[PDB]
């Protein structure tokens, strides 16, 4: 339930997203800011400091998958349930990630967009992006 204005606010900014970096930054920050989230990422090698998190090649590559997945979500805002259904079962049934962490990651993503865009990440833009991440987090959590 984003408005048309909100759709173009989101798309407007998203087109400017550094797709190679932003996902990794958001994931790195999640891992740093909420350290229990590292439990899911033992195969990722060194996450022992912020600097290793932020230089972790796999965090960067996987963060890029997470970002593309968001992009996926932005192209299917009228069907996030379907778009995220298998990832929902992945996260819930294989990975056992508590859904609260989807919200945190969404919000860290928002922090990273704010960081990257500054004044352009207006309260309105953020508002639109908050619906997207809520929609994504809810779509991901909809498999329990």
């Amino acid at each position: 339930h984003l408005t048309a204005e909100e759709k173009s606010l989101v798309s407007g900014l998203w087109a400017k997203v550094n797709v190679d970096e932003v996902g990794g930054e958001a994931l790195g920050r999640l891992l740093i800011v909420y350290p229990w989230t590292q439990r899911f990422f033992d195969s990722f090698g060194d996450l022992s400091t912020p600097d290793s998190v932020m230089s972790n090649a796999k965090v960067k590559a996987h963060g890029k998958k997470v970002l593309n997945s968001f992009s996926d979500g932005l192209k299917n805002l009228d069907n996030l349930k379907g778009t995220f259904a298998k990832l929902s079962e992945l996260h819930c049934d294989k990975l056992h990630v508590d859904p609260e962490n989807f919200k945190l990651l969404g919000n860290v993503l928002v922090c990273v967009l704010a960081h990257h865009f500054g004044k352009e990440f207006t309260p309105q833009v953020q508002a639109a992006y908050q619906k997207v991440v809520a929609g994504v987090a809810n779509a991901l959590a909809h498999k329990y």
Partner: protein
């Protein structure tokens, strides 16, 4: 526990925001109200339209409390005691709302100080706002 590093991060960040703190308090509320509109319902007495003087004036009050907290990182409970009572006893603010406002504070800060908003400082600021929220919700525990 705010570590020496956290406290340094929080303080240098607050040093950096300088005379903007008040405006950022208002932006943070604006962001909260827009992003999480149920938070508006705590301010039925406020004009919440764009450029609201009440929101601006209130963001300044919120800013000032955080600025006070930043001066008293050792003793947030003591610094924010009056405000704990206000928020729990008079306002009955749902704990969830502190997380929303805290998030919006972080966002506001990230919007204005990209350079300062490193992952570590993000973590420290997060811990800061959560520590303030904890004290502001302490009369629930």
């Amino acid at each position: 526990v705010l570590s020496p590093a956290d406290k340094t991060n929080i303080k240098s960040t607050w040093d950096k925001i300088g005379g903007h703190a008040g405006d950022y308090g208002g932006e943070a509320l604006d962001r909260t109200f827009q992003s999480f509109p149920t938070t508006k319902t705590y301010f039925p007495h406020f004009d919440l339209s764009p450029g609201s003087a009440q929101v601006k004036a209130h963001g300044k009050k919120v800013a000032d409390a955080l600025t006070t907290a930043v001066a008293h990182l050792d003793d947030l409970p003591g610094a924010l005691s009056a405000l704990s009572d206000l928020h729990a006893y008079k306002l009955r603010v749902d704990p969830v709302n502190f997380k929303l406002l805290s998030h919006c504070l972080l966002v506001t800060l990230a919007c204005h100080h990209p350079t300062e908003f490193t992952p570590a400082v993000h973590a420290s600021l997060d811990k800061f706002f959560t520590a303030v929220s904890t004290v502001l919700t302490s009369k629930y525990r």
